[PDB]
Ligand binder design. Structure first.
Ligand code: Z1E
Ligand code: ZN
Length: 193
């Protein structure tokens, strides 16, 4: 069964918003065939498997997501199922060639410590960088709020990609910090055989 795009999050205007593009009745048939003729748009895709939903971000012409979500699955497309270009189980990283219409985010180079996490609801949460792959939430949020948001981007104030949200540093149901795949790790993945 293929991963299916069910929505999108637009990050290029003055407003971050989500738009749902697929219901439940179509997801299952689209998953079995891997054929989805719906048009793609935006930097972030809301994707689903059998019973789980998460995010996928376009960076350097690749649509990236978490392995813990996608596994080795193909993604549904107008021509049929698309096989992964990249997979790093140790990094929890998967990638397919970006679909037509998906705009890629720019990798951040200003080395900002002030970061913004993008949720599946297109809510933008401020994060302070605490290392290469860690950031603390300025306002701690319960774990329940962050569920279904892995694969989404960490952005700098200029709106460039800093990382991909992978895990939360949880203490008694509260997420105090977030673990992310740095954008320099994605660049290493695209360069190595
Ligand atoms: C294949 O490799 C891997 C697979 N899986 C990994 O992590 C899994 C998935 C990830 C998760 O739930 N993702 C979220 C998520 O939203 N997932 S999802 O979209 O719901 C998914 C089910 C579709 C963003 C979370 C959200 F819940 F907050 N995990 C945690 O957030 C855990 N915290 C944790 O481990 O924090 C550290 C790292 C500090 C110990 C808690 C305790 C919350 C379960 C556990 C890998 C992590 C790393 Cl670093 C490297 C490789 C990994
Ligand atoms: Zn930047």
């Amino acid at each position: 069964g293929s991963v299916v795009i069910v929505g999108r999050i637009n990050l290029s205007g003055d407003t971050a918003y989500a738009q749902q593009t697929r219901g439940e009745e179509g997801c299952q048939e689209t998953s079995q065939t891997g054929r989805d003729k719906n048009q793609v748009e935006g930097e972030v895709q809301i994707v689903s498997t059998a019973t789980q939903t998460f995010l996928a971000t376009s960076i350097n012409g690749v649509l990236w997501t978490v392995y813990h979500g996608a596994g080795t699955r193909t993604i549904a497309s107008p021509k049929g199922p698309v096989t992964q270009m990249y997979t790093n189980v140790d990094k929890d990283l998967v990638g397919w060639q970006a679909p037509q219409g998906s705009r890629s985010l720019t990798p951040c180079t200003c080395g900002s410590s002030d970061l913004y996490l993008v949720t599946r609801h297109a809510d933008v949460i401020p994060v302070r960088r605490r290392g290469d792959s860690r950031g603390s939430l300025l306002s701690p949020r319960p774990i329940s709020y962050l569920k279904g948001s892995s694969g989404g981007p960490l952005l700098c104030p200029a709106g460039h990609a800093v990382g991909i949200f992978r895990a939360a540093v949880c203490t008694r149901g509260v997420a105090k910090a977030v673990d992310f795949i740095p954008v320099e790790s994605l660049e290493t993945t695209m360069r190595s055989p």
